[PDB]
Amino acid sequence: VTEHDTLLY
Amino acid sequence: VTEHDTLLY
Amino acid sequence: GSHSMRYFFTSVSRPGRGEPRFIAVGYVDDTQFVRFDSDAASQKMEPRAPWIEQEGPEYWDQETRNMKAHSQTDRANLGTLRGYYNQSEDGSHTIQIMYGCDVGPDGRFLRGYRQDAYDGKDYIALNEDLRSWTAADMAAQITKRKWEAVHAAEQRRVYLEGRCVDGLRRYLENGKETLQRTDPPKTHMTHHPISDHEATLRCWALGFYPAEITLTWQRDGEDQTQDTELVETRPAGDGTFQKWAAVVVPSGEEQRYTCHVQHEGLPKPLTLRW
Amino acid sequence: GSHSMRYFFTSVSRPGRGEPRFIAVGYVDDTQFVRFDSDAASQKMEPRAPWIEQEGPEYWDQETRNMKAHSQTDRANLGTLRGYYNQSEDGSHTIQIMYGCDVGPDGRFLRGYRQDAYDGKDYIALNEDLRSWTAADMAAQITKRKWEAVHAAEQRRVYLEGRCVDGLRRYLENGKETLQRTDPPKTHMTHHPISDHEATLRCWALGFYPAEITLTWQRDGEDQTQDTELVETRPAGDGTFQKWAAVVVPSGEEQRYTCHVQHEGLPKPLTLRW
Amino acid sequence: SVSTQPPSVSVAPGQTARITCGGNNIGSKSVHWYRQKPGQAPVLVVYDNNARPSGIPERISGSNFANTATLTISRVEAGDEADYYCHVWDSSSDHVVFGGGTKLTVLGQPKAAPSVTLFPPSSEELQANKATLVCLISDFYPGAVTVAWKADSSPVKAGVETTTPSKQSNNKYAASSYLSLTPEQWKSHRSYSCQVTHEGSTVEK
Amino acid sequence: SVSTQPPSVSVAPGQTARITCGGNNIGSKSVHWYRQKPGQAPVLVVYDNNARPSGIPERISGSNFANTATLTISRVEAGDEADYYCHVWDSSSDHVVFGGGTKLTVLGQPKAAPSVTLFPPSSEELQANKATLVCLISDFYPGAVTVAWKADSSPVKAGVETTTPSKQSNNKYAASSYLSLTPEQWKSHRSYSCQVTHEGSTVEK
Amino acid sequence: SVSTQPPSVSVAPGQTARITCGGNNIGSKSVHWYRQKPGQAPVLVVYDNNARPSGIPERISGSNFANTATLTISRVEAGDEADYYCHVWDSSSDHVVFGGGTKLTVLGQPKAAPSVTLFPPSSEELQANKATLVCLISDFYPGAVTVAWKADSSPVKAGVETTTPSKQSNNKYAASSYLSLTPEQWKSHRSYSCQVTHEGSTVEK
Amino acid sequence: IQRTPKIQVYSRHPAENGKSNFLNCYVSGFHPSDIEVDLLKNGERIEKVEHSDLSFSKDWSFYLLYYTEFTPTEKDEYACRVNHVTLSQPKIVKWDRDM
Amino acid sequence: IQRTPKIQVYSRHPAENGKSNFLNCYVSGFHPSDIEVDLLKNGERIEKVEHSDLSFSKDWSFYLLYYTEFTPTEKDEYACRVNHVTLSQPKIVKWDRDM
Amino acid sequence: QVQLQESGGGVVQPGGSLRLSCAASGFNFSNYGMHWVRQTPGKGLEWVASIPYDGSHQWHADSVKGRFTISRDNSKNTLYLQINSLRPEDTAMYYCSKARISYLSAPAWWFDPWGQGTLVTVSSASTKGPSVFPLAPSSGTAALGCLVKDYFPEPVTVSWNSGALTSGVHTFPAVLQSSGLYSLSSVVTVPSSSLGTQTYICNVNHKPSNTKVDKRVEPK
């Protein structure tokens, strides 16, 4: 199961 | 009357 | 019927220069009333209608800031998109936003709008709901979910259904003479022989407002979308519009072709014949 | 022993092209089960194991969105890092992310993971604690404190210890036949004479799963890390793996060299001799 | 800190059940769901709005948007009969907030209104300086009833005790409601009535 | 959830009136203002701090900064006499919060302090086992008075009723305030006092 | 708005003292510390979690993380004996929140448990229709005691007064606790008891 | 991506020789915004020429109107020259009395 | 920084002439990701070739597997050609029957 | 495999103090938060208190604040709940549950798994015989019964004609009245006719007080 949302650098 | 503030992409 | 207000913002990045060239124009229905130009020495939102400078300095001052600021954001945005698309600084790219609102015959709210475009292509746009965004390409989604975080969906709705409509209402009443007019088209027909066997029957309609107009050629009462030519409606430069529709005709049959003109400020549809 | 789930994300910025190529691959232990390719015509999370499409369309639908979105960010991130490092748009740069979780024999939570790397070099990564980040270089620090602001520490942990682990558990039971297998290596030895005084004793191990394997040559019962050669484990293309270890031998001493094989599947270690 | 669930939901076997958990901006909170069968501990069935744990079957799905989180059970089995509680964390309260709970009944019988039997205080108890009105509720299905007391068309609050419903022999449910009065209050008013409500309709005596 | 307005503001015609709506961090909330003339519904006059609707004249302007939103009416007309309520939404309260209301008076008269006439309980009423002190307040302008009762230098809570001011014949305002006592309490204390306050000044009896 | 400090902290001279200020997410508030010696005003010694003012020595350092702000004084001198209050601003309360205060004692004596002497109401006081239990607490160090009254193994709320500890001649502390009873209540129960607590240990009579 | 301009040249009023009219050149449907427009009195560049403010249509293609006061004769023939990025050499559209 | 690929050429099962086997070329440990891999039937390009999905190792160096069904003979001798940015000339590693 | 074991509950008296303990196995207890959630019988779940991984702070619901104190012993893998000044309101079952996510500084995410729990019931307990009053029939269907008031503890057992009547027999659950004494009724329907016919004696038996009551019911 892939992560819900992601982080920007 | 133009919009109060604006959105960044 | 209805009425409408639309603002058009364009920012073109000047390679080698900081401040891109910025042009903002405001319309009600089909009457422009405000202008802001980056390259103008004015540096202030100027009037472009007769009925708009009755608004005091409270209005022009806020309107200048409102798009001084709208220009500021586009400066940063032109750079942000330069990263989203892996683009070099030597280019010139355009950002176009258009937002506005539509009122009904009783001042009611009908429809809101906001659409953004990068280099003539759709980028992001606000849906009919006024609750949702639709992103054209990939990049616009990374902007979309950014706006979804800040409830940009809602906050457009509070402009469109709040201050936008109260302006369009206040404008339609302050310039009630200019804006609520209807102007029937002044029509005439033209006959130009091309060969010894064919000609062209051109159907003119000058001096009309609003620009909505319906020209139809008909042979024997049958619609003729074939040998028909229709130029897009042109502004006459004095707030009225012109449009002509022509048809190629075999000689001796002009009394068979009928041009039909439909306009809002026209009581019954027109019929023209040679 | 334990089990593991890993997703591998790679985004390589294509110069002159707005959207970079994106490749996401999902493994359990050493069995791949999902793939997503930007240049694939699917544009949808495809299945790549036999036991995953018993999950309904509600799963594939959300799983696609999940890494469409992960892709969007890398696009935006590829530009952000282009700025952190003073790099031109005509280059090609890679962002590699890997996150996943480890469960124990009783479905327990054991370890979480998330590591990010820019151009094959370490960038930012999540410590064991799951509460701390460690930034490799300068640039990663300006990102590190940005994530510390939003409690990215916590929310990674809530994926790793929640849906990640609940996924790995549900996969290990749905594909209980495939995933809990073990396959002892099918072994054999090779003799290639090289000189009139030396040869090469090669020690093969085909058809085994998982990929963990230990080949060691020994002279007279003494470890031989000297004239030993060990190729990295190769996949046979059918979910099983191969690995061989060779050694240079003085002629007439093959009965002195002993090859020892350790695998998870095998009850006790192997020994091969000529 | 206010999250409200319906008290009971009845659904036909194999249908789709739907339990709501309404709350002011509950969509911006992380809602969880626990299933508790009688006598055993609560079991996590849905966490963070929509995620299912490993053991939970895919029939059970979560949802949470706007001002209502929703637990949905597709293809209801008989073994889905239990109480269901939602779970949020009120950031601005330092309180984890459970919902009221929903008693899901998957009916095997048809639905029967309750038999209400009201007894006046006995003379033996009257001469014992007490008064107790015995309202007996039996032969209803599903097992969810509410009792209100009226002393001359006026509500009665304290002095009322009521049992928790329990299964009868014929698997209908039954419960009792007692009203402790002084012998004066039984004589003060001209009539007493026990009002039992079951599936929207009320039965009175 | 507490947003407070002044009770009344008096201004000369054509001057500039100014109504405040003070509140903790109301500068960060979206303030609205409604104008309610007697007998009619509220009418929106300023929304979102400073915006004017279509029909609202440019004389009416809004303001909201720091801890005080301010409604400003330039060139006050006689028709601007009404009640004004401010409107916020307390995000952390689930409550729309109206202000106390301000009666803007655009004075045509000068300002007159109130005439207070206080009556003790009549002998006929005393033999009916009741006591009522009648305080009559008349001939003040603007129409804003506050009544306090003092029984032997001590404030009086219950037993106090007070009318809403209304226009007299001469367009000044008048109202009445009654203090119901038991005949015992009227004899308990040595003196009773009716305190009427009007525009900072107080008149007593 | 709930931030809790220990009541007193005792530390050996030259050692390191440590005062905590626990609170729900007090680590996300900006904690300050004021030191108040008897009879004078508070003096800021640590503000914004860790910063020291100009005059404050580097021995005193602050700390604030998660749910516990901590004031730490290394190499304690005798002049560090004072009360210490932590200071936050509850954003979601519109209230500045001081801690309970901690009496830091740098002991010169050893520690002595209190001597409790309890007197029943004298016949002279009982014959005045009053009853007062006099609990006298003396010869303890550091100066921190808490008193509980038990009327027949049952807690006693009202009628209890207790002094603030004060230095004796020998620099130990002392305080007194009175229980006002009616002569009926004094005879109603069979025994009354004074419970004094000092340093975890309790002494009773 | 780029779009090439549509050009219409016309008079504001039905043209009559010797009566003051206005010469309009209306360029539309073009992209990007950088455009060059001149009006021509017998191959000569007309100086007293203004234009509208840059607005755009539904497909985001811009449109401008360049206008000049002019008194037409029968031999005087006017035209409009438009250079663009989509134009290698400037197009010229001469004013017809009935187009 | 760049890393150059390690290349192994092998069959899926121990090869026996005339029975359908599968030819694997497994390139690993390279960086960046742009890599070209072909299988060679006597220097000729085998067309029906698929590959694995781009995954990477602990040190972020990528690895790929290209495979095709093939029936080995004794005269047919195969090899794998790999061009890379770290490779000035495309490497070829020939398939050995016992490596 | 994660296991939670509550204990220490039982029957207490008001004012007293009580200590609950939860024995944990199947995870590094030193890294997770723990929670107490109580449930009054026949009612919903209610959050009590919770404590982070180290015991730094202590989260309290307001209804039990000041009276309860929750602690943990990481060297013993045990969660404790201290109840001071017990009240009738604390009568409930007390579940112990483990915050799923690690190192949480506050109890915000979901609690899984839950222990089977312990039961805390407080009362002014003392055994009592039940007073039995006849629920006489009204002067179709006819019903009558017995009212078994104010006994303690559970249970009473009612039979009719020494168990010789089963048709129409129906016993109801006992209420726990606000006094701490239970109260149960038990009736039997018979044909509207034939009320005159037979003796009607309910035989209540309360073993806790060793009381037996046989009461005959008759109309009017």
XYZ file of C-alpha atoms in Angstrom, chain B, chain C residues 7 63 66 77 84 116 147 156 159:
18
model
C -14.129 44.771 -8.459
C -11.014 42.643 -8.756
C -10.223 39.841 -6.351
C -8.823 40.630 -2.916
C -5.724 38.365 -2.914
C -4.177 35.820 -5.282
C -3.094 32.173 -5.456
C 0.401 30.819 -6.062
C 1.064 27.684 -8.109
C -11.503 40.409 -15.994
C -8.127 48.357 -7.357
C -5.535 44.569 -5.972
C 4.303 32.213 -10.462
C 7.539 22.780 -12.854
C -5.753 29.935 -15.583
C -4.940 24.864 -3.453
C -13.055 31.933 -4.827
C -15.425 36.539 -4.113
